[PDB]
Amino acid sequence: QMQLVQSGPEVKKPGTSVKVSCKASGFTFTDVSSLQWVRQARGQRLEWIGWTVVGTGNTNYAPRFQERVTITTDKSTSTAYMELSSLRSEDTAVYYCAAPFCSETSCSDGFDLWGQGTKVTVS
Amino acid sequence: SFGGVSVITPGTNTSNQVAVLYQGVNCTEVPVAIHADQLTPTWRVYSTGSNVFQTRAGCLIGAEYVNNSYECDIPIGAGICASYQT
Amino acid sequence: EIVLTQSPGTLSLSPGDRATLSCRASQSVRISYLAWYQQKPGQAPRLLISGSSSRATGIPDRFSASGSGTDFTLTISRLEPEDFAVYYCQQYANSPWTFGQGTKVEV
Amino acid sequence: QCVNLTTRTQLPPAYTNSFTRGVYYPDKVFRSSVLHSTQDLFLPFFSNVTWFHVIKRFDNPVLPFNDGVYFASIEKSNIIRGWIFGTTLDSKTQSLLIVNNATNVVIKVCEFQFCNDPFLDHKNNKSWMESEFRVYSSANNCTFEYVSQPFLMDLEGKQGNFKNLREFVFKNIDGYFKIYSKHTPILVREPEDLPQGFSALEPLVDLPIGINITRFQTLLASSSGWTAGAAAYYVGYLQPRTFLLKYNENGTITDAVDCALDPLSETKCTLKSFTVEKGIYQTSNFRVQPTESIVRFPNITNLCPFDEVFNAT
Amino acid sequence: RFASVYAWNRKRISNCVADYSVLYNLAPFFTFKCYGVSPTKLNDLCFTNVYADSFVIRGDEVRQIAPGQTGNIADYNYKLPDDFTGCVIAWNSNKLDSKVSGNYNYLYRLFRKSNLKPFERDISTEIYQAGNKPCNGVAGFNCYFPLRSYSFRPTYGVGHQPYRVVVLSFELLHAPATVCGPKKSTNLVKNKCVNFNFNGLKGTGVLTESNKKFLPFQQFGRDIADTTDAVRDPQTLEILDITPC
Ligand SMILES: *[C@@H]1O[C@H](CO)[C@@H](O)[C@H](O)[C@H]1NC(C)=O
Ligand SMILES: *[C@@H]1O[C@H](CO)[C@@H](O)[C@H](O)[C@H]1NC(C)=O
Ligand SMILES: *[C@@H]1O[C@H](CO)[C@@H](O)[C@H](O)[C@H]1NC(C)=O
Ligand SMILES: *[C@@H]1O[C@H](CO)[C@@H](O)[C@H](O)[C@H]1NC(C)=O
Ligand SMILES: *[C@@H]1O[C@H](CO)[C@@H](O)[C@H](O)[C@H]1NC(C)=O
Ligand SMILES: *[C@@H]1O[C@H](CO)[C@@H](O)[C@H](O)[C@H]1NC(C)=O
Ligand SMILES: *[C@@H]1O[C@H](CO)[C@@H](O)[C@H](O)[C@H]1NC(C)=O
């Protein structure tokens, strides 16, 4: 059906880097669709990280994430990758990818579809 | 739905008035199809013309039906002939 | 550069009653770039209304949007016991996006 | 110089039936003493054209255009002078510039940033002159330049006794600009309705420029306010029709008929003759066109595993 | 320098003599297939008007220039009519267009409200809104920029190099010709069974004088059988009259 899938929770070590993916068979990346990434810590307010455009390839990052995160989208494999570096204990949280059901020129102003999230923890 | 169309005319010099026959159709089929971009002939104004008389070859529009008898002038079909009279 | 505050902080009302919540910002006025969300423990957040004028897929008519100024409001006609969750207000128009703090409703 | 004069006044229009006008030469070949049946975009016979009248008036919109429409003006004062075609008037999309002031005929397709209303009308109270020549601003990359002979102009302007009657049908096929024109100075009457008669339309500018027409204006000829004379112009729309055309022994069109007007004309063009004798004639069939489209393919929407086959280790 | 994909130039070629020998003599000319004619018979016919279109596209989309092709460059950038007459030439130009530091002066549509009919004109670069909500101003959510720039570097493999393309289109023998081939005229002969070649027309007959009046935009006469029987001499503009032996 129309629902996104994602990998499982992962455990890493300090001084390492990870790659997080939201390749979903329940959604078509097409060329107008875009997805944002959100992070949820333990009992904390949600924070916006970034969203990217499949078609033009333009990105949009947080004012504080221009040093340890990179976001890229591959239309051929219909996936979105983030390379995350410098993972401390404050970066251990659940990641979620959201993208509206936007095929061709028809789509709304809200991100209806929602991934279940991956719990990244680093000791 | 598809069919044929015939035109009943006297001589061109004699007059410029005509009658049109729709071959082998119940006469209530054609009034339904009177809409823009729905009939190959575009002159659908004629279908809402003069009184319609139904015959075995289809109903002809634009000619009335007297009940006396004359000699056949323009043979319509199945015992009906049309003519140009006063 | 936008900070959202959601009010009231906490609620405790009988199920089936009518409730209304609001969220506040300090930046420019926009009504069509605001979205409301509910997140449940152990589950991803779900969208309720986007732009304060349209509903999402499968959203019942219980959630009603309102407000014409910088304020944003949502109203629930009846509190069926599964709706106890936290609401989040999100904007799009301005500099990089930021969510609210969340409003938790209790039984 | 140009002026944002604004202060536009508009009046309700009138309706008039164009009897037989709007017939032009379809191809560049000489035939004589034949009957030729051609399917093309024509103005239907006895169509309803929108009549417009000018005293205290100011109109210059785009003509609703599908590579061709019909425009007929009855005048004596020679108000309409040139042509300016443009989709954005922003010096980015190359715009036309067709100018014939007294004798020159200059065609230039060049990126132009024009004014709001390019008007040659307003200048020096009653008197008329070729003012506001530089309606454009910049001419960076101009493609085509060409000089030829002008139309039959009228010196200065005359109010009343509008002898002249100009018919223009606008289009351009395969890049060949074709503003078909016919200028007859025969109006012995009041303007009133369009006259009755027959006259073909030679392609006056059949020239390889190249670009098409979709949104344009026709140039009408101190810098604010005017009190002009009476004039009348008529606008009509073309449709795809099949016409039967008759050529006399001299090689010019004399009469024509359209198949899709009446059953009489239908059988006239079925028999390939202008007269039909008494009888019963069979003609085109009777069909019902489909009204919409429906597509039903199976529900499943997965991905066929193609890369595994094509890119296995 | 050739123009972008979305601003293909259209050059005038008329009132001159065209020699296609040098055109077909260039070594790297590879994608050279002609539809209405055969490439070796371009030197013996007269064309009423010739046009040339220049643009540079990626290698993976050169196949989209054939008539009737569907895709993403043949719907928003440049489309050929189904009745195309003429032909296209394509050749690799990785030597010039690509740059060491990166050349980013080639653009092309990414989004459009609808496709475009053959050759229909436009440039406008206004923003395009994905959502039902009207967007204005600048870029943001559900309203983007319809342009992307090609990245042409030598590091790219086959299938991404710039490919200069030129398209030639022309009608055939229905108007006073202006572009001709290299041929030598001769002296006209009256009232004798000869083998005439009048600007492309090959036939046999005897040529006489005619009184029928040809309008300035006409060159051929026709009859009920629809065969030519009256032609106007190019050099000297009297009207002849063709009749068989
Ligand atoms: C016109 O048609 C009538 C038909 O009766 C015929 O008698 C007459 O001679 C015709 N006149 C012509 C062809 O001039
Ligand atoms: C036309 O259809 C009606 C309705 O069924 C029927 O009563 C009538 O007999 C039909 N007429 C002919 C001429 O078939
Ligand atoms: C014949 O028609 C006339 C009117 O047209 C009518 O008065 C008369 O009654 C009809 N005759 C019969 C036998 O129906
Ligand atoms: C009219 O005003 C507009 C807006 O200032 C301007 O873009 C335009 O060029 C003006 N036109 C003329 C003819 O002054
Ligand atoms: C068409 O023109 C006639 C002639 O004046 C007029 O009576 C009629 O109302 C017009 N119809 C339309 C639809 O304009
Ligand atoms: C057209 O150009 C010629 C050449 O200079 C000139 O004689 C004539 O006056 C011009 N027509 C005008 C200015 O109306
Ligand atoms: C004609 O117009 C010019 C420029 O607008 C002006 O200088 C001149 O005074 C005017 N003359 C008359 C008689 O209106």
Numbering used by the authors:
A (entry chain I): 1 to 123
B (entry chain B): 588 to 673
C (entry chain K): 1 to 107
D (entry chain B): 14 to 68, 75 to 240, 251 to 342
E (entry chain C): 343 to 587
Quote the passages of the study that discuss this structure, keeping the authors' original sentences.
Omicron (B.1.1.529), the most heavily mutated SARS-CoV-2 variant so far, is highly resistant to neutralizing antibodies, raising concerns about the effectiveness of antibody therapies and vaccines. Omicron is the most heavily mutated variant to emerge so far, with more than 30 mutations in its spike (S) protein, 15 of which occur in the receptor binding domain (RBD). To delineate the structural basis for antibody-mediated neutralization, we determined the cryo-electron microscopy (cryo-EM) structure of a prefusion-stabilized Omicron S trimer in complex with representative Fab fragments. The two highly potent antibodies against Omicron (XGv347 and XGv289, with IC50 values of 0.006 and 0.016 μg ml−1, respectively), one monoclonal antibody (XGv282 with IC50 of 0.268 μg ml−1) with intermediate neutralizing activities against Omicron, but high neutralizing activities against the other four VOCs, and a monoclonal antibody (XGv265 with IC50 of 7.479 μg ml−1) with more than 500-fold decreased neutralization against Omicron, but potent neutralization against four other VOCs were selected for structural investigations.
The strauctures of XGv347–Omicron S structures revealed three distinct conformational states: three XGv347 Fabs bound to a completely closed S with three RBDs in the down state; two XGv347 Fabs bound to RBD in either two up or one up and one down configuration. XGv347 bound to an epitope at the tip of the RBD, largely overlapping with the patch targeted by ACE2. Unexpectedly, the epitopes of XGv347, A23-58.1 as well as their sister neutralizing antibodies would be normally inaccessible for the RBD-down conformation in the WT S, but become accessible for either up or down RBDs in the Omicron S owing to a markedly outward expansion and clockwise rotation of approximately 10º of three RBDs, leading to an approximately 9 Å conformational movement of the receptor-binding motif (RBM). The XGv347 paratope comprised 5 CDRs with heavy chain and light chain contributing 70% and 30% of the binding surface area, respectively.
